[PDB]
Amino acid sequence: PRYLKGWLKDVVQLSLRRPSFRASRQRPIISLNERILEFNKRNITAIIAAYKRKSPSGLDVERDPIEYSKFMERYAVGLAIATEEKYFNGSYETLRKIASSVSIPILMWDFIVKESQIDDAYNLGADTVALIVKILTERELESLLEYARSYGMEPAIVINDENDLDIALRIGARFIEIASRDLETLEINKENQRKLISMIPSNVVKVAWQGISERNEIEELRKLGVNAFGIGSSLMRNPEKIKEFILGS
Numbered sequence: 654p655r656y657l658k659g660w661l662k663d664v665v666q667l668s669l670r671r672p673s674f675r676a677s678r679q680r681p682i683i684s685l686n687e688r689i690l691e692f693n694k695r696n697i698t699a700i701i702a703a704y705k706r707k708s709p710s711g712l713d714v715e716r717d718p719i720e721y722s723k724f725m726e727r728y729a730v731g732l733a734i735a736t737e738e739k740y741f742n743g744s745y746e747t748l749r750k751i752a753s754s755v756s757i758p759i760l761m762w763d764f765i766v767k768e769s770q771i772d773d774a775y776n777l778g779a780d781t782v783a784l785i786v787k788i789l790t791e792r793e794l795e796s797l798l799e800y801a802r803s804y805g806m807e808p809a810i811v812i813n814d815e816n817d818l819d820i821a822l823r824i825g826a827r828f829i830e831i832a833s834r835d836l837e838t839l840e841i842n843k844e845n846q847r848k849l850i851s852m853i854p855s856n857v858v859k860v861a862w863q864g865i866s867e868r869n870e871i872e873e874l875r876k877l878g879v880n881a882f883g884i885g886s887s888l889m890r891n892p893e894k895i896k897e898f899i900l901g902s
């Protein structure tokens with residue numbers, strides 16, 4: 654991983670030590686970026702709903718993850734399931750159970766720093782993973798992206814500034830998450846997010862993530878070329894808000 658400080662250094666150290674999940678996958682791979690483009694062609698707003706029991710940007714939410722994921726199967730283009738243990742209060746078992754219960758694409762959200770965690774995502778049933786530019790060197794990013802694609806996954810490459818975007822293009826990202834929250838300070842900068850979105854080539858599948866809370870914002874971002882919208886805490890609180898994000902109120 655890159656030289657890191659503070660909580661990022663801590664979470665990367667923890668992830669390096671994460672024991673692997675050693676069972677065979679029992680689920681097809683279903684492409685999250687292809688389904689996003691299908692929604693686009695169908696003029697259906699594409700929301701990637703996240704399940705996260707906690708995050709550094711929100712309070713813990715104790716809801717049944719299965720009931721949540723079955724509800725979202727009706728509406729969302731894909732689910733993102735936060736599996737990191739210390740800061741997201743996640744578990745591989747929650748991912749495994751959700752993947753066993755739903756037939757929409759699933760992204761495993763965690764801090765992926767070694768190949769065995771991509772083996773884990775595949776074996777647990779996730780269709781794809783995020784890879785985070787801020788924590789991985791270019792060589793690790795390239796290696797892990799190639800590794801994930803050898804399983805038939807197309808990872809979301811997470812960026813939050815111009816440096817990250819330059820590295821995403823350099824490693825041949827096809828599917829970019831433009832995160833409006835800086836991982837290190839937790840600050841949201843939407844002006845920067847919109848600038849980055851305007852700099853991405855039109856053939857890359859773009860997900861705007863973090864701080865999206867209104868149908869109007871989604872409509873604005875769609876007009877700038879964004880393909881899909883990742884939304885976590887507002888849906889962890891009120892899953893039915895997803896109906897207004899897709900259909901208006």
Ligand SMILES: O=[N+]([O-])c1ccc2[nH]nnc2c1
Binds near residue numbers: 704733735811832883
């Ligand atoms: O909780 N999540 O599943 C999840 C998904 C994507 C994200 N991007 N930035 N933070 C994120 C958290």
